[PDB]
């Protein structure tokens, strides 16, 4: 028995509400709901995207990578269209635009496709790192060389300059390993984000199952 | 148009089937399905548990940790009951027993509870590692000291022995950092497992939504 939970708008007009953005939790529209068969629920998945915009854009970047790895040529090549500006703005402008459209996407069908492509990219990257690290001598399969360079892209000895030649040979592996440490840190952050986001989506679907009955 | 996909048992009697365990894919029972409101689907989630038993037991261990961190005292303290043997067997025997019961669990309601507790444990561990690493000097919050020791548990200088005293002071941090590297590797593996498992569960729920209509 918790009237403050049944009546959240009335609760927000009290003296003991500590919410950071009162009343946002009852705003209803495409940006805060999902639907299956045009039955709507207020979506934990949409709330996550709003609370965690920074990580959501990291996952959108993975979607773009997934598209290229699935040969979705047109989707990939048009992914930065319709940005309007002829000048620089946010460094992540095309990703920010897609984030807005993802927030606007209500159908479970379309959101299933999004998470499926992101997970495909995450598994591809994990498989490439396992291959990198399975022997101290670095040897990658053909497909994993491609994944290595794709992730790397979509994301001197002043005392005796002649000695830099030897330094470069020694350092080639340090640079590759540094790339993999960076990719590994990005993957852990993307995985913790994905785990939480898809659990929120899973809980939203239970809510839909309850309501569709 | 793919008759071999509509008629998988007939396909398994052909000359071009490469499946590793033909006919397993049409076995129907509690161990291969889930249900909502007693509407059943053949479950990707159950197939994952069967293909990935090793990782499933890692996630079950996280459930047990989650229980202790949520104060579920009775569930925790009884979690190794009913093992029958008075001798040693599989090193993971109580976890193996629980794995069998998880595979036997059909209701979406109960499986939601499982994943929710596991995710709680994963987030707790990630938060503890972020705290460990946020300064080179190691300082953990009170709650994170507890999480550090819980995860660590649930999972000499022969030339001049006197010098070991100094060695131990130097090595205390190396041991703690080694623990965190080990925990970090376990977390990445648990996260990649969880990502795939809960996506399979999410896809199963879409299948249920389609069928419940
Ligand atoms: Ca290799
Ligand atoms: Ca700290």
Author numbering:
A (entry chain A), B (entry chain A): 10 to 164, 178 to 235
What do the study authors state?
Viral occlusion bodies (OBs), also called polyhedra, are stable protein crystals that encapsulate newly assembled virions within virus-infected cells. The crystalline polyhedra is formed by repeating units of the ~27.5 kDa ToNV polyhedrin protein, which is predominantly helical, containing ten helices and a short two-stranded antiparallel beta sheet. The ToNV polyhedrin structure is almost completely helical, with a 3D fold not previously observed (to the best of our knowledge).
The native sequence contains only an N-terminal methionine. Due to the small size of the crystals, small wedges of data were collected per crystal and then merged to form a final dataset using data from 55 crystals.
